[PDB]
C-alpha cells in the first residue's frame, strides 16, 4: 500500500482521491497526498498524545471532548491553530480574574 | 409567551459563571436575550438556506455546521 | 447560629464549578422551542434533526460564554467587578459584530 | 430481512485509532471525541488544500505538488508546529520515493 | 514606436465605465478608483463562486447552475442588496433563455 | 453573431465570466445560466457603488470618482459597509467621526 | 498678549483635518527602510516593487487608524479621554490578535 | 540600520488623530511601534513566503495583497 511505503497510518490514496475530487486543481502531484497525509497524521498524533495525557491525569482510559479541549487550549500553538474553532462538550479552562478573588 | 424568556435568569447566570463573571447587573438578562436571538437568527437563516437549497423540509446537523463555519465559528464533533 | 456566605463567595464557588464542567447550561427544551420559533420566520413546517438543535445549542453556549469573558474584561477595565449592558456593547463593537 | 442500507459514510476514525494506539496503547476515545478528531482532520485538510489551490492558481500552475503543500503548511501552522509538519512531510515523501 | 507588445492584463474597467455612463453619464473615474472597482468585482466573483462551489459540493453535484449562484448570493449579500441582485440575475437568465 | 451579454441585456461580459468559472477550480461543470446570473449580480453591485460614488463626487463639486468618493459611499450605506466590512479601500480615509464626550461643552 | 489655544482645541482641529484627508501620515522613506529591515530577518537581498511598499503602508495605516478607534472607545469606557497602553492591549485582546 | 524610530512620535499622533483620538499618553508611542512591527512581520513573512514559492527575488504587490487577504485584512487597489 502507498501508506505502507510512506511509513504512515493515514490513507495516501484517500487523500490523493480527495485532492482530485475536491476542486483544488486540474492535476495533483504524486508527492502531494503523501505529504498532506503525513502532516495530517503528525497533527493528529500531537493532539492525541496530549489529550491522552489529560485522560491519564483524570484516571480515565478513554479520551472525551474535555480531554481534547484541555490538550488544545493549554498548548500555545494548537490553541492558535484552532482559535476560531469550538470543541463540542469541551468547556473552558479554569481561569478567574485576579481582582475578582478575595485578599 | 416569547420562547426567548425560556432562556431564564438562572441559565444566563450559569453561562456568565463559565465565562468567569462574578457580579451581574439586572439589565444583562434582557441584553443577553437580545444578543442570543440575533446570534440564532443569523446562524439559523443560513442553515435553512442550505436546507431550502437541498430541497428538504428537515434541517440537518450539517446544515447548522455549514452555517456556523460561514459565520466564522467553526464547530467540531457534529459531522465536520 | 444561622450560617451566611458573603456576597461574592457563592458566585466564586459557581464559577469554579461551571468552569470544571462541560454540560450544557441552558435547559434543552425551552432552547429547542426558541430555535423552532425563530426558524418559522424563514420557513414554515420545518423539521429538525435532534443533533441539529444540539449543534445550535453547543454553538450558542460557547459564543455567549466567550462573550462573557470579553465583557468581563470590559467591566474590569472600567474599574468594576459588575458586568453591564455597555460592557457587552463595547465588546461586540470591538469584535466587529455591531457597528 | 437483510434490509441492505450500508450507507457507507466515510471517516478517518480507523486511522485515528491506529495513531492513538501508537502514541498510547492502553487508552481509547469516546464517540463524540472521535467526532472532534474527524472534524479536526477535515478542517485542516480543507485549509491546506485550499491554500495549496491558491498557490498553484496564483502561479498559473495546473498541478498541486508537495511543494504547494509545504508552502501552505508554512503559511497556515504556527512556528514550531510548522517546522515539524514540514519535517514529517519531507521525510514521508523521501521514504515513499525510495520504496517501489 | 517600440517593439514587443506589453503582456495582456485583464480588467473589468471597460464594463465599469459602461455601467458608470448609465448611472452617472456626466461622471468619470480616477486611475486608483478603477483599481478599487476591479479589486471589488474580483472579490465578489471569488466569494460568490466559492460559495456556489461549496453548495454544489455539499449536495454531491458536479454542476454549478444559476440556482447555486442565487443561493450563494442569498447567503453573502445583505437584505436589500440580495433582493435586487436576485431580481437582476433572474431577469438576466429569463431574458437570455428567451433570446436563446 | 451577437454576444451572450446582449442576449442577457447586460454590460458585464457573460462569456468572460463563464470562462473564469471553468478556469477557477470551482466545479467540474458549469451551467449556462450561472455566468449570466453572476455577471448580472456583479453589474448590479457595481452600479449600486457607482451611483453612490458619483453622488459623493458631485457633492465634492468633482466630475471624476476617486477612492475617497467610493469609501464615503460605501461606509455611509449600512449594507455595503456590511458587505465590505473586512475590506480596506486604499487612499479612502475615514468618515469624519469625533466621539461626543471629546467635544467642548 | 501672545495668543494661546487651550489644551484640547488643536487636538480636535488635527482630528477634523486628518479625518477629512486620505493621504498617508507616516513618512514614506522611514517606512520603506523599516519594510526592508524586517524583510531581512526572513530572506536577505530582497527587492521590492514600489507598489508593494505602498500596499504595505496603505495596509499598516488602515490597521493602526482602525486600532486607534477601538482604543479610543476603551479609554472612553473607563471614563478617560487619554489613550493608554492598556487600552490598546484590551482592544487587541478582544479582537483576538493577542492572548 | 535601526529604522523603527523613523516611525516618529508626530506620525503616530497623526494616525491617532485620524482615528479620532484627542489625548495621548507618553507611553503610547513605544507601545504602537511594537504593534506596528508585529503587524509588519506577520504580513511580510507571508508575502515573502509567496515570493519564495514563486522563485522570485523581488516582492510584488500581489505577494502583499495575497498576504493581507490571508490575515483577514483584504486590500483593494493594488491589483487585488
Ligand atoms: Ca508524538
Swiss-Prot record, chain A:
Keywords: Acetylation, Chromosome, Citrullination, DNA-binding, Hydroxylation, Isopeptide bond, Methylation, Nucleosome core, Nucleus, Phosphoprotein, Ubl conjugation
Residues carrying N6-(2-hydroxyisobutyryl)lysine: 21, 59-60, 80, 103
Example of a GO MF term: DNA binding
Modified residues (N6-crotonyllysine): 21, 103
Post-translational modification: It is involved in the initiation of both imprinted and random X inactivation. Ubiquitinated H2A is enriched in inactive X chromosome chromatin. Ubiquitination of H2A functions downstream of methylation of 'Lys-27' of histone H3 (H3K27me). H2AK119Ub by RNF2/RING2 can also be induced by ultraviolet and may be involved in DNA repair. Glutamine methylation at Gln-89 (H2AQ104me) by FBL is specifically dedicated to polymerase I. It is present at 35S ribosomal DNA locus and impairs binding of the FACT complex.
Residues found modified as N5-methylglutamine: 89
Main location: nucleus
The organism's place on the tree of life at top rank: Eukaryota
Residues the record lists as N6-glutaryllysine modifications: 80, 103
Residue list for modification N6-succinyllysine: 80
Signal peptide as annotated in the record: none
In-chain residues carrying the UniProt-annotated modification N6-(beta-hydroxybutyryl)lysine: 21, 80, 103
Subcellular location: Nucleus; Chromosome
GO biological process, one term: negative regulation of cell population proliferation
Cellular component, GO annotation: CENP-A containing nucleosome; extracellular exosome; nucleosome; nucleus
Subunit structure: The nucleosome is a histone octamer containing two molecules each of H2A, H2B, H3 and H4 assembled in one H3-H4 heterotetramer and two H2A-H2B heterodimers. The octamer wraps approximately 147 bp of DNA.
Protein family per UniProt: Belongs to the histone H2A family.
Name this polypeptide is given: Histone H2A type 1-B/E
Organism: Homo sapiens
Gene name for this UniProt entry: H2AC4
Curated annotation (Swiss-Prot), chains B, H:
Residue list for modification N6-butyryllysine: 9, 22, 55, 57, 69
Position of the Glycyl lysine isopeptide (Lys-Gly) (interchain with G-Cter in UFM1) cross-link: 9
Residue ranges that the Swiss-Prot or TrEMBL entry lists as coiled coil: none
Residues with PTM N6-(2-hydroxyisobutyryl)lysine: 9, 22, 37, 55, 57, 69
Main location group: nucleus
Chain positions found as N6-(beta-hydroxybutyryl)lysine: 9, 55, 69
Cellular compartments annotated: Nucleus; Chromosome
Listed GO MF terms: DNA binding; protein heterodimerization activity; RNA binding; structural constituent of chromatin
Keyword Cytoplasm recorded: no
Sites bearing Phosphoserine, chain numbering: 25
Mutagenesis or variant effect for residue 10 to R: In TEBIVANED3; results in early developmental defects when expressed in zebrafish embryos
Chain positions found as N6-lactoyllysine: 9, 55, 69
N6-propionyllysine found at: 9, 22, 55, 57, 69
Record's signal peptide: none
Covalent cross-link site, Glycyl lysine isopeptide (Lys-Gly) (interchain with G-Cter in ubiquitin): 69
Effect listed in the UniProt record for changing residue 18 to L: In TEBIVANED4; results in early developmental defects when expressed in zebrafish embryos
Its job: Core component of nucleosome. Nucleosomes wrap and compact DNA into chromatin, limiting DNA accessibility to the cellular machineries which require DNA as a template. Histones thereby play a central role in transcription regulation, DNA repair, DNA replication and chromosomal stability. DNA accessibility is regulated via a complex set of post-translational modifications of histones, also called histone code, and nucleosome remodeling.
Record's protein name: Histone H4
Organism from which the protein derives: Homo sapiens (Human)
UniProtKB/Swiss-Prot annotation, chains C, G:
Residue positions where N6-lactoyllysine is found in the record: 20, 43
Residues recorded with modification Phosphoserine: 21, 50
Annotated positions of the N6-(2-hydroxyisobutyryl)lysine modification: 20, 28, 43, 86
Post-translational modification summary for this protein: Acetylation is generally linked to gene activation. Acetylation at Lys-86 (H3K122ac) by EP300/p300 plays a central role in chromatin structure: localizes at the surface of the histone octamer and stimulates transcription, possibly by promoting nucleosome instability. H3R2me2a is present at the 3' of genes regardless of their transcription state and is enriched on inactive promoters, while it is absent on active promoters.
Residue numbers bearing the N6-succinyllysine modification: 20, 43, 86
GO molecular function: cadherin binding; DNA binding; protein heterodimerization activity; structural constituent of chromatin
Modified residues (Phosphothreonine): 44, 71
Biological process (GO), any one: telomere organization
Modified residues (N6,N6,N6-trimethyllysine): 20, 43
Phosphotyrosine modified-residue sites: 5
Sites bearing N6-glutaryllysine, chain numbering: 20, 43, 79, 86
Residue numbers carrying N6-crotonyllysine: 20
DNA-binding recorded as keyword: yes
Modified residues (N6-(beta-hydroxybutyryl)lysine): 20, 43, 86
Subcellular locations according to the entry: Nucleus; Chromosome
Residue positions where N6,N6-dimethyllysine is found in the record: 43
Record keywords, A-Z: Acetylation, ADP-ribosylation, Chromosome, Citrullination, Disease variant, DNA-binding, Hydroxylation, Lipoprotein, Methylation, Nucleosome core, Nucleus, Phosphoprotein, Ubl conjugation
Record's GO cellular component terms: extracellular exosome; extracellular region; membrane; nucleoplasm; nucleosome; nucleus; protein-containing complex
Chain positions with N6-acetyllysine modification: 20, 43, 79, 86
PTM sites of type N6-methyllysine: 1, 20, 28, 43, 86
Similarity comment text for this entry: Belongs to the histone H3 family.
Protein name (record): Histone H3.1
Part of the whole protein covered: 38 to 136 of 136
Curated annotation (Swiss-Prot), chains D, E:
Modification type N6,N6,N6-trimethyllysine: residues: 60
Annotated Gene Ontology cellular component terms: CENP-A containing nucleosome; cytosol; extracellular space; nucleoplasm; nucleosome; nucleus
N6,N6-dimethyllysine found at: 32
Residues annotated with N6-crotonyllysine modification: 9
N6-glutaryllysine PTM sites in chain numbering: 9, 18, 21, 83, 91, 95
Modified residues (N6-acetyllysine): 60
Omega-N-methylarginine: residues carrying this PTM: 61, 67
Modified residues (N6-methylated lysine): 91
Domain of life: Eukaryota
Subunit description: The nucleosome is a histone octamer containing two molecules each of H2A, H2B, H3 and H4 assembled in one H3-H4 heterotetramer and two H2A-H2B heterodimers. The octamer wraps approximately 147 bp of DNA. Heterodimer H2BC11 and H2AZ1 interacts with VPS72 (via N-terminal domain).
Descriptive protein name: Histone H2B type 1-J
Name of encoding gene: H2BC11
Full-sequence range covered: 27 to 126 of 126
Amino acid at each position: 500500500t502507498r501508506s505502507s511505503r510512506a511509513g504512515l497510518q493515514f490513507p495516501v490514496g484517500r487523500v490523493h482521491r480527495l485532492l482530485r475530487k475536491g476542486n483544488y486543481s486540474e492535476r495533483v502531484g504524486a508527492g502531494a497526498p503523501v505529504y498532506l497525509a503525513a502532516v495530517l497524521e503528525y497533527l493528529t498524533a500531537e493532539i492525541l498524545e496530549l489529550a491522552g495525557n489529560a485522560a491519564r491525569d483524570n484516571k480515565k482510559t478513554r479520551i472525551i471532548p474535555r480531554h481534547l479541549q484541555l490538550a488544545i487550549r493549554n498548548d500555545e500553538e494548537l490553541n492558535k491553530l484552532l482559535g476560531r474553532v469550538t470543541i463540542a462538550q469541551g468547556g473552558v479552562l479554569p481561569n478567574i480574574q485576579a481582582v475578582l478573588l478575595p485578599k | 409567551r416569547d420562547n426567548i424568556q425560556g432562556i431564564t435568569k438562572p441559565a444566563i447566570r450559569r453561562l456568565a459563571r463559565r465565562g468567569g463573571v462574578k457580579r451581574i447587573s439586572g439589565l444583562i438578562y434582557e441584553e443577553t436575550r437580545g444578543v442570543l436571538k440575533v446570534f440564532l437568527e443569523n446562524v439559523i437563516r443560513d442553515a435553512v438556506t442550505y436546507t431550502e437549497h437541498a430541497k428538504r423540509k428537515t434541517v440537518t446537523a450539517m446544515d447548522v455546521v455549514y452555517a456556523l463555519k460561514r459565520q466564522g465559528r467553526t464547530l467540531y464533533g457534529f459531522g465536520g | 447560629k444561622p450560617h451566611r456566605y458573603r456576597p461574592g463567595t457563592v458566585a466564586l464557588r459557581e464559577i469554579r464549578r461551571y468552569q470544571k464542567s462541560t454540560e450544557l447550561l441552558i435547559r434543552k427544551l425551552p432552547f429547542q422551542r426558541l430555535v423552532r420559533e425563530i426558524a418559522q420566520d424563514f420557513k414554515t413546517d420545518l423539521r429538525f434533526q435532534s443533533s441539529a438543535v444540539m449543534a445550535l445549542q453547543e454553538a450558542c453556549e460557547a459564543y455567549l460564554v466567550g462573550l462573557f469573558e470579553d465583557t468581563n474584561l470590559c467591566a474590569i477595565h472600567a474599574k468594576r467587578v459588575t458586568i453591564m449592558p455597555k460592557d457587552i456593547q463595547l465588546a461586540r463593537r470591538i469584535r466587529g459584530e455591531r457597528a | 430481512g437483510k434490509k441492505r442500507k450500508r450507507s457507507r459514510k466515510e471517516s478517518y476514525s480507523i486511522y485515528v485509532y491506529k495513531v492513538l494506539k501508537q502514541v498510547h496503547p492502553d487508552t481509547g476515545i469516546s464517540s463524540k471525541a472521535m467526532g472532534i478528531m474527524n472534524s479536526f482532520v477535515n478542517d485542516i485538510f480543507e485549509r491546506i488544500a485550499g491554500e495549496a489551490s491558491r498557490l498553484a492558481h496564483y502561479n498559473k500552475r495546473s498541478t498541486i505538488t508537495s511543494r504547494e503543500i509545504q508552502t501552505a503548511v508554512r503559511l497556515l501552522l504556527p512556528g514550531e508546529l510548522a517546522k515539524h509538519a514540514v519535517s514529517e512531510g519531507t521525510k514521508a515523501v523521501t521514504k515513499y520515493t525510495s520504496a517501489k
